[PDB]
Design a protein around this ligand. Structure first.
Ligand SMILES: O=C(/C=C\c1ccc(O)c(O)c1)O[C@H](Cc1ccc(O)c(O)c1)C(=O)O
Lengths: 298, 296
């Protein structure tokens, strides 16, 4: 059962390079606006304790160099929305897809198009961790790379990369500039919180194992949401809510395994291991498929 | 350290749908040729014992319906090269990238754009397994989906999907229609041989780990090449050849760890497991990064 990323072509045609003085990063060119992290206007010195409103007042359109491949785009206005810089440019991107800006919840998945100085390098499938970071392999100079989902030709942009945290994970904002997680765009001391496993996604993945004919972990037992969540506590799993149960409702109706029956399976796997067995050819429990991801690919 | 697929846009613009009778699958539209699996001309029954020369001689150009989005392409010639059908069409694809066809070897990696009925659905990064199969995620009807690498904006096409094997793995051809492995485009009892781990790829990834500052799995031992292979083959690891040792030369020089010293570390990892630790971002020994991948 392979993780898959969305086809990235619609996003590839929006990636540009944004340069302000000595700093170069990636920007997103949609219609006549280029979106990028506001810390592009900061000198390493500024990063220490920036006043972004002031730093931007001292900037002019001529301070921004935007390049779309071989072509310079002329900036004709600049503004900020939260942590995102918005550069109005002279030309509308003729490759702008149908798109929306959306904010996702921890545990949800998206694809990231990793870019180096405006040029797309690779694409991978992510989950937003419960601690609001992304475990990403990242190029040098990937700031401003974006995360997205695609639904019927409409690109839903959900993430823009802003920073690497000391533990090697990544932190960013939605496309309206609101941070995911308790992080700020400053060179200060900050660290990811202790992470947990995304329980509703593990359950979804066990449903995928059953749809694919791996059934050995199924047992006769059921459990209670409360009894399960105390077991979840001890193994650093996110608490499971009635919301999560209803979301798994389709897979429970499709496979015949009630969610609390599957929870009894997961509780046993957590307490006793896999006894040398494998689930979808894996010895570890996967938590970066959502229930939606599983219904989609199955 | 995440497995990344190549950006798929250059291939998305080449995917089309090919229909012959009641059979529909994916085709690849490059210049004025559409490439697709020749079993598009078969019904399910034909698959037991297809005679492709007989099935194809009975077809004319208008028996092939090619759709590129909302536009029908007119087929104006056809021919078979090994196991791929080549449909000549009216129109050169305006979105044809710089491209080439390359036949890869087991252990090599590539991205696969998985498609249903001509529309791209997802992209993932692959290794050609030592048993010449792909551990894919095939949608129903993903036949004709292609595998590729992209190097300096030139797309190297190396794989086209033809068959599902009974174990859930996938078999296919290069773009000249020659199957990878002993498989055929016929519904026989063929099965993937025992899969092995790509040893040279695990060792390259261990060097990646050391370059990025993980050293906990190193030890003070070395090994002969032959002692290493005697042990590794007991874990279903591929034998390591002197070519592989040479290939790891650069990463050895970069890290100051002799290749056979890294082999000793692998031997101990296989003996001990990870003891709850991780190497790059993983709790398993990763074998789908090549030595070429790691230098990048
Ligand atoms: O796809 C077909 C071909 C034709 C077909 C075409 C229209 C039908 O209504 C029908 O029932 C069958 O059959 C397959 C060939 C094939 C396609 C995709 C695979 O993944 C595979 O393993 C084999 C088979 O039986 O081996």
């Amino acid at each position: 059962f392979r993780k898959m990323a969305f086809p990235s072509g619609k996003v590839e045609g929006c990636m540009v390079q944004v340069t302000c003085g000595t700093t170069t990063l990636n920007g997103l060119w949609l219609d006549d606006v280029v979106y990028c992290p506001r810390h592009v206007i900061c000198t390493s010195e500024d990063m220490l304790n920036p006043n972004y409103e002031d730093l931007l007042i001292r900037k002019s359109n001529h301070n921004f160099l935007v390049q779309a491949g071989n072509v310079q785009l002329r900036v004709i206005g600049h503004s900020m929305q939260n942590c995102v810089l918005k550069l109005k440019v002279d030309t509308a991107n003729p490759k702008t897809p149908k798109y929306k800006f959306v904010r996702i919840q921890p545990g949800q998945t998206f694809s990231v198009l990793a870019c180096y100085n405006g040029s797309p390098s690779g694409v991978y499938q992510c989950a937003m961790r419960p601690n609001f970071t992304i475990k990403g392999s990242f190029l040098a100079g990937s700031c401003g790379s974006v995360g997205f989902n695609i639904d019927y030709d409409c690109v839903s942009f959900c993430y823009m990369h802003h920073m690497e945290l000391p533990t090697g994970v990544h932190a960013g904002t939605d496309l309206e500039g609101n941070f995911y997680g308790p992080f700020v765009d400053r060179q200060t001391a900050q660290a990811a919180g202790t992470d947990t496993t995304i329980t509703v996604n593990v359950l979804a993945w066990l449903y995928a194992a059953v749809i694919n004919g791996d059934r050995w972990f199924l047992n006769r037992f059921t459990t209670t949401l409360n009894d399960f969540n105390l077991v979840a506590m001890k193994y650093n799993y996110e608490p499971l809510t009635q919301d999560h149960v209803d979301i798994l409702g389709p897979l429970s109706a499709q496979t015949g395994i009630a969610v609390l029956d599957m929870c009894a399976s997961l509780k046993e796997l957590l307490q006793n291991g896999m006894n040398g067995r494998t689930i979808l050819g894996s010895a570890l429990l996967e938590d970066e498929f959502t229930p939606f991801d599983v219904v989609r690919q199955c």
